Short mmCIF file of N, CA and C in Angstrom, two decimals:
data_model
loop_
_atom_site.label_atom_id
_atom_site.label_comp_id
_atom_site.label_asym_id
_atom_site.label_seq_id
_atom_site.Cartn_x
_atom_site.Cartn_y
_atom_site.Cartn_z
N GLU A 1 0.51 -1.28 0.17
CA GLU A 1 0.17 0.05 0.05
C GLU A 1 0.87 0.89 0.34
N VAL A 2 0.85 1.98 -1.10
CA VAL A 2 1.08 3.52 -1.29
C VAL A 2 0.67 4.53 -0.60
N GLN A 3 0.40 5.17 0.21
CA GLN A 3 -0.30 6.53 0.14
C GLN A 3 0.86 7.65 -0.51
N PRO A 4 0.60 9.00 -0.37
CA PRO A 4 1.83 10.04 -1.40
C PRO A 4 3.42 10.31 -0.60
N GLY A 5 2.81 10.34 1.01
CA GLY A 5 4.20 10.46 1.65
C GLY A 5 4.30 9.01 2.90
N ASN A 6 3.76 8.20 2.70
CA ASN A 6 3.79 7.00 3.48
C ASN A 6 3.34 5.93 2.80
N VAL A 7 4.34 4.58 3.21
CA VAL A 7 4.22 3.68 2.62
C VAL A 7 4.47 1.85 3.13
N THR A 8 3.53 1.32 3.25
CA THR A 8 3.76 -0.11 4.46
C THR A 8 3.81 -1.04 3.27
N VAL A 9 4.29 -2.30 4.21
CA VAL A 9 4.47 -3.75 2.93
C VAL A 9 4.10 -4.51 4.12
N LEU A 10 2.67 -4.65 3.73
CA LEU A 10 1.85 -5.58 4.88
C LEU A 10 2.24 -7.45 4.71
N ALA A 11 3.55 -7.67 4.97
CA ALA A 11 3.86 -9.34 4.31
C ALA A 11 3.21 -9.97 5.50
N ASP A 12 3.63 -11.13 4.88
CA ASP A 12 2.99 -12.33 5.34
C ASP A 12 4.19 -13.50 5.93
N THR A 13 3.64 -14.71 6.97
CA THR A 13 5.02 -15.02 7.60
C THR A 13 5.14 -15.95 6.90
N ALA A 14 4.00 -16.97 5.82
CA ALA A 14 4.83 -18.42 4.95
C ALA A 14 3.79 -18.08 3.61
N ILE A 15 4.54 -18.73 2.57
CA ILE A 15 4.05 -18.84 1.53
C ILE A 15 2.60 -18.68 1.21
N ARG A 16 1.84 -18.55 0.79
CA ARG A 16 0.37 -18.30 0.90
C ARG A 16 -0.03 -18.79 -0.59
N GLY A 17 -0.49 -19.69 -1.19
CA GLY A 17 -1.47 -20.01 -1.78
C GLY A 17 -2.65 -20.41 -1.93
N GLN A 18 -3.70 -21.10 -3.21
CA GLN A 18 -4.62 -21.73 -2.81
C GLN A 18 -4.53 -23.34 -2.13
N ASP A 19 -3.24 -24.48 -2.96
CA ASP A 19 -3.68 -25.58 -2.43
C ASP A 19 -2.40 -25.94 -1.46
N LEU A 20 -2.12 -25.04 -0.75
CA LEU A 20 -0.90 -24.94 0.38
C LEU A 20 -2.09 -24.73 1.27
N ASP A 21 -3.14 -23.66 1.76
CA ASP A 21 -4.04 -23.88 2.69
C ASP A 21 -4.83 -24.81 2.64
N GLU A 22 -4.94 -25.61 1.60
CA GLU A 22 -6.12 -26.61 1.26
C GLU A 22 -5.50 -27.87 2.62
N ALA A 23 -4.14 -27.75 2.34
CA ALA A 23 -3.51 -28.91 3.12
C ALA A 23 -3.42 -28.93 4.48
N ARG A 24 -3.20 -27.67 4.64
CA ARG A 24 -3.78 -27.29 5.92
C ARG A 24 -5.12 -27.63 6.62
N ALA A 25 -6.20 -26.47 5.87
CA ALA A 25 -6.87 -26.93 6.15
C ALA A 25 -7.60 -28.73 6.57
N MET A 26 -7.42 -29.30 5.07
CA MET A 26 -7.51 -30.76 5.78
C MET A 26 -7.08 -31.59 6.81
N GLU A 27 -5.88 -31.07 7.44
CA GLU A 27 -5.08 -31.62 8.02
C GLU A 27 -5.59 -30.99 9.74
N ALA A 28 -6.30 -30.15 9.82
CA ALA A 28 -7.08 -29.20 10.56
C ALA A 28 -8.70 -29.85 10.92
N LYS A 29 -9.10 -30.12 9.52
CA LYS A 29 -10.45 -31.51 9.77
C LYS A 29 -9.91 -32.04 10.05
N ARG A 30 -9.19 -33.22 9.96
CA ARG A 30 -8.58 -34.37 10.00
C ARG A 30 -8.37 -34.67 12.21
N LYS A 31 -7.22 -33.73 12.35
CA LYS A 31 -7.39 -33.84 13.83
C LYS A 31 -8.55 -33.63 14.54
N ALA A 32 -9.89 -33.05 13.98
CA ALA A 32 -10.59 -33.06 14.83
C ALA A 32 -11.96 -33.87 14.97
N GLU A 33 -11.59 -35.20 13.86
CA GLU A 33 -12.56 -36.36 13.30
C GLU A 33 -11.49 -37.31 14.63
N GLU A 34 -10.38 -37.88 13.94
CA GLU A 34 -9.48 -38.65 14.89
C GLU A 34 -8.97 -37.61 16.04
N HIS A 35 -9.17 -38.00 17.12
CA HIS A 35 -8.99 -37.39 18.08
C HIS A 35 -7.40 -36.97 18.86
N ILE A 36 -6.72 -36.33 17.62
CA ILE A 36 -5.21 -36.01 18.19
C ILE A 36 -5.10 -35.24 18.74
N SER A 37 -4.90 -35.11 19.70
CA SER A 37 -4.56 -34.44 20.30
C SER A 37 -2.98 -33.94 21.25
N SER A 38 -2.36 -32.75 20.55
CA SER A 38 -0.73 -32.88 20.59
C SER A 38 -0.81 -31.78 21.49
N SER A 39 0.66 -32.78 22.20
CA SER A 39 0.87 -32.43 23.29
C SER A 39 1.68 -30.66 23.09
N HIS A 40 2.05 -30.41 23.88
CA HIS A 40 2.50 -28.72 24.50
C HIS A 40 3.96 -29.03 24.05
N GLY A 41 4.93 -27.84 24.32
CA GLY A 41 6.13 -28.59 24.76
C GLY A 41 6.58 -27.51 25.29
N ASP A 42 5.87 -27.30 26.51
CA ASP A 42 6.56 -26.36 28.00
C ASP A 42 6.88 -27.37 28.84
N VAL A 43 7.76 -27.43 28.28
CA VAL A 43 8.88 -28.34 30.04
C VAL A 43 9.06 -27.55 30.86
N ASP A 44 9.17 -26.50 30.85
CA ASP A 44 9.41 -25.83 32.78
C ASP A 44 7.79 -26.41 32.93
N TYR A 45 6.69 -25.86 32.50
CA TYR A 45 5.86 -26.35 33.35
C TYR A 45 5.69 -27.75 33.39
N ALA A 46 5.63 -28.68 32.44
CA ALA A 46 5.97 -29.94 32.63
C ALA A 46 6.35 -30.71 34.11
N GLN A 47 7.68 -30.11 34.46
CA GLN A 47 8.71 -30.35 35.18
C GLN A 47 7.76 -29.89 36.73
N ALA A 48 7.51 -28.19 36.23
CA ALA A 48 6.69 -28.08 38.40
C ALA A 48 5.51 -28.77 38.43
N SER A 49 4.51 -28.75 37.31
CA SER A 49 3.50 -29.20 37.74
C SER A 49 3.51 -30.82 38.52
N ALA A 50 4.64 -31.26 37.22
CA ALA A 50 5.05 -33.20 38.00
C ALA A 50 5.32 -32.99 39.50
N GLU A 51 6.35 -32.25 39.65
CA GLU A 51 7.03 -31.48 41.16
C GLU A 51 5.70 -31.73 42.31
N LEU A 52 5.18 -30.14 41.70
CA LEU A 52 3.52 -30.08 42.66
C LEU A 52 2.55 -31.21 43.08
N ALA A 53 2.69 -32.08 41.59
CA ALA A 53 1.69 -33.26 41.91
C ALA A 53 2.39 -34.32 42.72
N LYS A 54 3.63 -34.57 43.13
CA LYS A 54 4.12 -35.42 43.65
C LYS A 54 4.45 -34.86 45.28
N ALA A 55 4.47 -33.86 45.89
CA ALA A 55 4.80 -32.91 46.83
C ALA A 55 3.66 -33.33 47.65
N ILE A 56 2.11 -33.01 46.82
CA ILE A 56 0.83 -32.57 47.43
C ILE A 56 0.36 -34.08 47.52
N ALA A 57 1.06 -35.42 46.74
CA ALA A 57 -0.06 -36.87 47.61
C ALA A 57 -0.10 -36.80 48.44
N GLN A 58 -1.44 -37.13 48.88
CA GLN A 58 -1.77 -37.96 50.57
C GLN A 58 -0.58 -37.31 51.42
N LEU A 59 -0.63 -35.84 51.22
CA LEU A 59 -0.35 -35.09 52.62
C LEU A 59 -0.90 -35.33 53.60
N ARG A 60 -2.34 -35.28 53.10
CA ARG A 60 -3.36 -35.64 54.78
C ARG A 60 -3.04 -34.54 55.56
N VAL A 61 -2.60 -33.32 55.49
CA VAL A 61 -1.90 -32.32 55.95
C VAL A 61 -3.24 -31.88 56.83
N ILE A 62 -4.78 -31.39 56.31
CA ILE A 62 -6.18 -31.33 56.74
C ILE A 62 -6.41 -31.94 57.74
N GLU A 63 -6.71 -33.68 57.49
CA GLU A 63 -6.83 -34.49 58.67
C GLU A 63 -6.03 -34.47 59.98
N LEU A 64 -4.91 -33.87 59.79
CA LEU A 64 -3.83 -33.80 60.79
C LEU A 64 -3.85 -32.66 61.75
N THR A 65 -3.49 -31.62 60.98
CA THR A 65 -3.53 -30.59 62.02
C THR A 65 -5.80 -30.17 61.49
N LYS A 66 -6.49 -29.69 62.65
CA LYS A 66 -7.56 -29.95 63.32
C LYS A 66 -8.37 -28.65 62.25
N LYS A 67 -7.93 -28.21 61.43
CA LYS A 67 -9.04 -26.84 60.22
C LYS A 67 -9.90 -27.22 60.64
N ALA A 68 -11.44 -27.28 60.65
CA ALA A 68 -12.47 -27.32 60.04
C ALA A 68 -13.27 -27.42 58.38
N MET A 69 -12.90 -26.49 57.83
CA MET A 69 -12.95 -26.60 56.66
C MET A 69 -14.16 -26.21 55.99
N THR B 1 -27.14 -53.41 88.82
CA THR B 1 -27.76 -54.04 89.32
C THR B 1 -29.44 -53.64 89.62
N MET B 2 -29.78 -52.25 89.43
CA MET B 2 -31.16 -52.18 89.55
C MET B 2 -31.97 -52.97 88.43
N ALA B 3 -31.18 -52.46 87.47
CA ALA B 3 -30.95 -52.68 85.25
C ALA B 3 -31.36 -54.38 85.29
N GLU B 4 -30.66 -55.09 86.17
CA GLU B 4 -30.54 -56.42 86.21
C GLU B 4 -31.48 -57.28 87.40
N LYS B 5 -31.63 -56.63 87.88
CA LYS B 5 -33.48 -57.20 88.38
C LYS B 5 -34.45 -56.64 87.83
N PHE B 6 -34.46 -55.78 87.02
CA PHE B 6 -35.47 -55.64 86.32
C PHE B 6 -35.71 -56.35 85.03
N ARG B 7 -34.05 -57.09 84.54
CA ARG B 7 -33.69 -57.75 83.22
C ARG B 7 -34.43 -59.23 83.80
N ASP B 8 -34.10 -59.32 84.74
CA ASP B 8 -34.45 -60.95 85.65
C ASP B 8 -36.07 -61.54 85.94
N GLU B 9 -37.00 -60.29 86.06
CA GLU B 9 -38.38 -60.56 86.00
C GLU B 9 -38.93 -60.30 84.69
N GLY B 10 -38.16 -60.51 83.77
CA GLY B 10 -38.74 -61.44 82.11
C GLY B 10 -38.73 -60.45 81.60
N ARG B 11 -38.69 -58.67 82.34
CA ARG B 11 -39.16 -57.65 81.36
C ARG B 11 -37.99 -57.13 80.09
N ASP B 12 -38.05 -56.01 79.36
CA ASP B 12 -36.83 -55.55 78.80
C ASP B 12 -36.73 -54.22 79.23
N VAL B 13 -35.57 -53.52 79.27
CA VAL B 13 -35.59 -52.23 80.22
C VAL B 13 -34.63 -51.17 79.19
N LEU B 14 -34.63 -50.22 79.58
CA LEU B 14 -33.74 -48.78 79.08
C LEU B 14 -32.92 -48.78 79.96
N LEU B 15 -30.93 -48.70 79.55
CA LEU B 15 -30.12 -48.50 80.67
C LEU B 15 -29.45 -47.26 80.26
N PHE B 16 -29.85 -45.68 80.57
CA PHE B 16 -29.08 -44.68 80.08
C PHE B 16 -27.49 -44.79 80.85
N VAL B 17 -26.19 -44.30 80.56
CA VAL B 17 -25.59 -44.28 81.32
C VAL B 17 -24.73 -42.86 81.17
N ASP B 18 -24.63 -41.87 82.08
CA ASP B 18 -24.32 -40.89 81.32
C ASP B 18 -23.02 -40.24 81.69
N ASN B 19 -21.80 -41.54 82.07
CA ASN B 19 -20.67 -40.58 81.38
C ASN B 19 -20.05 -42.27 81.97
N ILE B 20 -19.60 -42.84 81.24
CA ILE B 20 -18.57 -44.34 82.07
C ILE B 20 -17.50 -44.16 82.10
N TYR B 21 -16.76 -42.88 81.60
CA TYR B 21 -15.41 -42.88 81.11
C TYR B 21 -15.07 -42.50 82.82
N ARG B 22 -16.18 -41.79 83.87
CA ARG B 22 -15.84 -41.62 84.93
C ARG B 22 -15.59 -42.77 85.99
N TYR B 23 -16.13 -43.47 85.21
CA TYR B 23 -15.76 -44.93 86.01
C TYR B 23 -14.57 -45.40 86.17
N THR B 24 -13.81 -45.37 84.96
CA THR B 24 -12.22 -45.31 85.13
C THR B 24 -11.86 -44.62 85.57
N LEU B 25 -12.15 -43.47 85.20
CA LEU B 25 -11.36 -42.20 85.82
C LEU B 25 -11.20 -42.18 87.58
N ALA B 26 -12.31 -42.03 88.12
CA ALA B 26 -12.75 -42.57 89.17
C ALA B 26 -11.45 -43.89 89.67
N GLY B 27 -11.11 -44.38 89.11
CA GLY B 27 -10.32 -45.65 89.51
C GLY B 27 -8.84 -45.72 89.30
N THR B 28 -8.61 -44.84 88.48
CA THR B 28 -7.29 -44.02 88.52
C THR B 28 -7.52 -43.32 89.22
N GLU B 29 -7.83 -42.43 89.76
CA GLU B 29 -7.35 -41.18 91.13
C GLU B 29 -7.71 -42.14 92.12
N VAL B 30 -7.73 -42.84 92.12
CA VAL B 30 -7.46 -44.41 93.43
C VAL B 30 -6.21 -44.99 93.38
N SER B 31 -6.05 -45.45 92.52
CA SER B 31 -5.43 -46.57 91.93
C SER B 31 -3.63 -46.67 92.43
N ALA B 32 -2.78 -45.56 92.51
CA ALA B 32 -2.01 -45.34 93.36
C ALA B 32 -1.59 -45.51 94.26
N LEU B 33 -2.97 -44.94 95.17
CA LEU B 33 -2.59 -45.30 96.33
C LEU B 33 -3.45 -46.87 97.04
N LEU B 34 -3.91 -47.52 96.45
CA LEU B 34 -3.40 -48.89 96.85
C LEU B 34 -2.33 -49.43 96.42
N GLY B 35 -0.87 -49.08 95.80
CA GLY B 35 -0.21 -49.10 95.92
C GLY B 35 -0.01 -50.00 94.39
N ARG B 36 -0.48 -49.56 93.29
CA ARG B 36 -0.41 -50.62 91.61
C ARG B 36 0.32 -49.79 90.80
N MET B 37 1.14 -50.20 90.13
CA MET B 37 2.56 -49.58 89.51
C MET B 37 1.70 -48.85 88.18
N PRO B 38 1.97 -47.87 87.92
CA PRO B 38 0.86 -46.88 86.76
C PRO B 38 1.36 -47.76 85.67
N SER B 39 0.52 -47.19 84.78
CA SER B 39 0.45 -48.42 83.05
C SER B 39 1.01 -47.18 81.98
N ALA B 40 0.15 -47.77 80.96
CA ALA B 40 0.42 -46.40 79.83
C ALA B 40 0.68 -44.76 79.63
N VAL B 41 -0.92 -44.84 80.30
CA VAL B 41 -0.49 -43.36 80.43
C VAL B 41 -0.77 -42.61 81.90
N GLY B 42 -0.42 -43.32 83.12
CA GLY B 42 -0.98 -43.66 83.98
C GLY B 42 -2.30 -43.81 84.66
N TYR B 43 -2.45 -44.72 83.72
CA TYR B 43 -4.13 -46.16 84.04
C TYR B 43 -3.51 -46.37 84.55
N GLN B 44 -4.23 -47.05 85.44
CA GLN B 44 -4.16 -48.63 86.65
C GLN B 44 -4.04 -49.07 85.64
N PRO B 45 -2.90 -50.30 86.31
CA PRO B 45 -2.59 -51.26 85.07
C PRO B 45 -3.77 -52.65 85.07
N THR B 46 -4.68 -52.60 85.79
CA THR B 46 -6.34 -52.85 85.50
C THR B 46 -7.13 -52.41 84.88
N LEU B 47 -7.09 -51.46 84.07
CA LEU B 47 -7.97 -50.61 83.52
C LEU B 47 -8.94 -51.76 82.59
N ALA B 48 -8.70 -52.74 81.42
CA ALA B 48 -9.13 -53.87 81.29
C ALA B 48 -10.01 -54.08 81.36
N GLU B 49 -9.35 -55.22 82.59
CA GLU B 49 -10.17 -55.52 83.56
C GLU B 49 -11.32 -55.30 84.35
N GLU B 50 -10.94 -53.77 84.86
CA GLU B 50 -12.17 -52.91 85.84
C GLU B 50 -13.16 -52.82 84.86
N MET B 51 -12.77 -52.50 83.05
CA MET B 51 -13.72 -52.03 82.03
C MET B 51 -14.46 -53.65 81.65
N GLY B 52 -13.95 -54.35 81.76
CA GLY B 52 -15.00 -55.40 81.32
C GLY B 52 -15.56 -55.87 82.55
N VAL B 53 -15.42 -56.01 83.63
CA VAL B 53 -16.11 -56.68 84.78
C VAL B 53 -17.40 -56.38 84.32
N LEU B 54 -17.30 -54.47 84.77
CA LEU B 54 -18.68 -54.17 84.23
C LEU B 54 -19.41 -53.89 82.96
N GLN B 55 -18.66 -54.00 81.85
CA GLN B 55 -19.55 -53.89 80.16
C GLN B 55 -20.01 -55.12 80.11
N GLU B 56 -19.43 -56.51 81.03
CA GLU B 56 -19.92 -57.52 80.21
C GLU B 56 -21.27 -58.07 80.98
N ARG B 57 -21.81 -57.67 82.19
CA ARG B 57 -23.29 -57.84 82.55
C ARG B 57 -24.19 -56.78 82.43
N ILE B 58 -23.83 -55.78 81.46
CA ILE B 58 -24.82 -54.98 81.19
C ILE B 58 -25.15 -55.66 79.31
N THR B 59 -26.00 -56.79 79.45
CA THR B 59 -26.39 -57.18 77.97
C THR B 59 -27.63 -57.90 78.40
N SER B 60 -28.34 -58.05 76.85
CA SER B 60 -29.52 -58.86 77.00
C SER B 60 -29.18 -60.27 77.45
N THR B 61 -30.36 -61.03 77.52
CA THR B 61 -30.22 -62.23 77.68
C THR B 61 -31.76 -63.04 77.26
N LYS B 62 -32.02 -64.31 77.24
CA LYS B 62 -32.82 -65.43 76.64
C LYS B 62 -33.76 -64.76 77.62
N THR B 63 -34.15 -64.44 78.89
CA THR B 63 -35.12 -64.11 79.81
C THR B 63 -35.80 -62.66 79.34
N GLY B 64 -35.04 -62.24 79.53
CA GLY B 64 -35.15 -60.22 79.14
C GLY B 64 -33.75 -59.28 78.08
N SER B 65 -34.16 -58.28 78.22
CA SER B 65 -33.29 -57.66 77.38
C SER B 65 -32.53 -56.46 78.11
N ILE B 66 -31.58 -55.70 78.21
CA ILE B 66 -31.39 -54.59 78.25
C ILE B 66 -30.65 -53.64 76.90
N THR B 67 -31.56 -52.55 76.45
CA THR B 67 -31.34 -51.76 75.43
C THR B 67 -30.02 -50.49 76.18
N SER B 68 -29.33 -49.86 75.80
CA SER B 68 -28.31 -49.18 76.47
C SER B 68 -28.02 -47.89 75.62
N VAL B 69 -27.80 -46.83 75.99
CA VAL B 69 -26.93 -46.42 75.55
C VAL B 69 -25.56 -45.27 76.47
N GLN B 70 -24.48 -45.07 76.03
CA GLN B 70 -23.46 -45.07 76.98
C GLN B 70 -22.83 -43.53 76.27
N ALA B 71 -22.70 -42.79 77.06
CA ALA B 71 -21.38 -41.77 77.24
C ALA B 71 -20.32 -42.04 77.03
N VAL B 72 -19.42 -42.08 76.26
CA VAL B 72 -17.98 -41.82 76.67
C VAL B 72 -17.26 -40.87 76.33
N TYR B 73 -16.71 -40.02 77.57
CA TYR B 73 -15.60 -38.73 76.80
C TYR B 73 -14.19 -39.10 76.52
N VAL B 74 -13.83 -39.04 76.09
CA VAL B 74 -12.58 -39.19 75.42
C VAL B 74 -11.71 -38.23 75.46
N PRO B 75 -10.66 -38.01 76.36
CA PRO B 75 -9.76 -36.91 77.09
C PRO B 75 -9.05 -36.17 75.86
N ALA B 76 -8.80 -34.84 75.99
CA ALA B 76 -8.30 -34.38 74.54
C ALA B 76 -8.15 -34.34 73.45
N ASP B 77 -9.65 -35.10 73.26
CA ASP B 77 -10.11 -35.57 72.18
C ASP B 77 -9.35 -36.47 71.26
N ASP B 78 -8.45 -37.02 72.54
CA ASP B 78 -7.34 -38.23 71.35
C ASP B 78 -8.07 -39.76 71.57
N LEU B 79 -9.15 -39.49 70.12
CA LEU B 79 -9.23 -41.13 70.22
C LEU B 79 -8.58 -42.60 70.60
N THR B 80 -6.96 -42.00 70.59
CA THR B 80 -6.38 -43.41 70.56
C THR B 80 -5.85 -43.47 71.58
N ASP B 81 -6.12 -43.04 72.86
CA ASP B 81 -6.13 -42.47 74.06
C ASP B 81 -6.64 -44.38 75.10
N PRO B 82 -5.72 -44.98 75.81
CA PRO B 82 -6.35 -46.27 76.12
C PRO B 82 -7.60 -46.14 76.78
N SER B 83 -8.48 -44.91 76.88
CA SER B 83 -9.71 -45.26 77.65
C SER B 83 -10.79 -45.14 76.51
N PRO B 84 -10.83 -44.76 75.63
CA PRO B 84 -11.97 -45.10 74.54
C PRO B 84 -11.03 -45.56 73.87
N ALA B 85 -9.85 -46.30 73.81
CA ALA B 85 -9.56 -47.32 73.34
C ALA B 85 -10.24 -48.61 73.77
N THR B 86 -9.71 -49.07 74.47
CA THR B 86 -10.06 -49.59 75.63
C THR B 86 -11.87 -50.26 75.32
N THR B 87 -13.25 -48.87 76.03
CA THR B 87 -14.07 -49.33 74.98
C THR B 87 -14.84 -50.16 74.57
N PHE B 88 -14.22 -49.52 72.72
CA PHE B 88 -14.99 -49.38 71.50
C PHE B 88 -15.44 -50.89 71.43
N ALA B 89 -14.50 -51.95 71.81
CA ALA B 89 -14.50 -53.02 71.42
C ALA B 89 -15.80 -53.86 72.57
N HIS B 90 -16.37 -53.17 73.15
CA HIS B 90 -17.35 -53.17 73.84
C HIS B 90 -19.10 -52.81 73.52
N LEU B 91 -18.70 -52.22 72.51
CA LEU B 91 -19.85 -51.51 72.10
C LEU B 91 -20.75 -52.46 70.87
N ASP B 92 -22.05 -52.39 70.26
CA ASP B 92 -22.30 -53.25 69.34
C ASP B 92 -22.68 -51.55 67.82
N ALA B 93 -23.05 -50.35 68.56
CA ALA B 93 -23.10 -49.23 67.35
C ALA B 93 -21.92 -48.04 68.12
N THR B 94 -21.27 -47.66 67.54
CA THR B 94 -20.32 -46.67 68.46
C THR B 94 -20.69 -44.83 66.89
N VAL B 95 -21.23 -44.02 67.77
CA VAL B 95 -21.18 -42.90 67.33
C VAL B 95 -20.23 -41.91 67.59
N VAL B 96 -19.33 -41.58 66.71
CA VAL B 96 -18.28 -40.75 66.98
C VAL B 96 -18.86 -39.44 66.45
N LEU B 97 -18.67 -38.09 67.69
CA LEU B 97 -18.79 -37.34 67.77
C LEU B 97 -17.60 -36.12 67.44
N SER B 98 -17.14 -34.81 66.82
CA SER B 98 -16.15 -34.43 66.75
C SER B 98 -16.48 -32.95 66.57
N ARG B 99 -14.73 -31.79 67.01
CA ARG B 99 -15.44 -30.96 67.43
C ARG B 99 -15.05 -30.16 66.21
N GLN B 100 -14.62 -30.75 65.39
CA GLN B 100 -14.18 -29.78 63.69
C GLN B 100 -15.59 -29.85 63.31
N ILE B 101 -16.32 -30.48 63.48
CA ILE B 101 -17.67 -30.28 62.60
C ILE B 101 -18.87 -29.57 63.76
N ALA B 102 -19.03 -29.99 64.57
CA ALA B 102 -19.65 -28.75 65.69
C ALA B 102 -19.61 -27.27 65.28
N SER B 103 -18.25 -27.29 65.58
CA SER B 103 -17.69 -26.01 65.19
C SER B 103 -18.31 -25.03 63.73
N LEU B 104 -18.75 -26.27 62.50
CA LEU B 104 -19.74 -25.78 61.58
C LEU B 104 -20.54 -24.93 62.08
N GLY B 105 -21.42 -25.85 63.10
CA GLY B 105 -22.38 -25.58 63.70
C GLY B 105 -23.49 -26.68 63.31
N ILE B 106 -22.91 -27.90 62.75
CA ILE B 106 -23.49 -28.70 62.41
C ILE B 106 -24.06 -29.97 63.41
N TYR B 107 -24.89 -29.38 63.99
CA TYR B 107 -25.47 -30.56 65.22
C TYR B 107 -26.48 -31.80 64.20
N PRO B 108 -26.63 -32.81 64.99
CA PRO B 108 -25.56 -33.78 65.41
C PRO B 108 -24.61 -33.36 65.18
N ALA B 109 -23.15 -33.02 65.72
CA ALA B 109 -21.48 -33.59 65.36
C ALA B 109 -21.44 -34.69 64.86
N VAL B 110 -22.08 -35.63 64.61
CA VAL B 110 -21.39 -37.26 64.44
C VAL B 110 -20.87 -36.93 62.82
N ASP B 111 -19.62 -37.68 63.42
CA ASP B 111 -18.54 -38.12 61.95
C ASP B 111 -18.34 -39.66 61.32
N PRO B 112 -20.10 -39.44 59.82
CA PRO B 112 -20.42 -40.41 59.38
C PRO B 112 -18.94 -41.29 58.66
N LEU B 113 -18.01 -40.73 59.04
CA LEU B 113 -16.85 -42.10 58.08
C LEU B 113 -15.88 -42.82 59.22
N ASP B 114 -16.48 -42.18 60.65
CA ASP B 114 -15.99 -42.69 62.01
C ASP B 114 -16.78 -43.73 62.32
N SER B 115 -18.33 -43.32 63.07
CA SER B 115 -19.31 -44.25 63.09
C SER B 115 -19.77 -45.49 62.49
N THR B 116 -20.08 -46.11 63.33
CA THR B 116 -20.35 -47.65 62.80
C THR B 116 -21.30 -48.31 63.14
N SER B 117 -21.58 -49.72 62.97
CA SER B 117 -22.77 -50.30 63.69
C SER B 117 -22.75 -51.73 63.01
N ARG B 118 -22.73 -52.78 64.14
CA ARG B 118 -22.55 -54.21 63.59
C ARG B 118 -23.79 -54.39 63.04
#
């Protein structure tokens, strides 16, 4: 887009065609019927969550101290 | 003894005992003066025999029956103290009340994960 004293180029991140996008559409449609739920890759959250799950396991704290709740 | 007289007459009786813990506590208060060595938490050495010699004669029989309800104070809320611990065995239905429920206002403060019945 060119204006008289300004110009801007609204670029794209990946090659955009017709048949390129239809492959993406078909893959996204497949993954919804076949329940292929892929995993994220946040390894920090994976480790923190697993340590937090183990540490809190069978603590029985609330039975031990007499909080009413 | 009163309840047993009514039972032997062939009747069927109700016997309510307002705190049976105080029988064992009065036994403790006097045990050491009788010259008997202390046991687990200062309790008399004959705790379980004193307790059984009573709870065994409060029972129904082929001639007449006694229903009963006994309040059993548990000291310091410690359900593992020797005195409640030896009494649990002598009951058919045990109802355990708890302070951490009564403080919620939920009366009767029965603990349903600890009450049980034969």
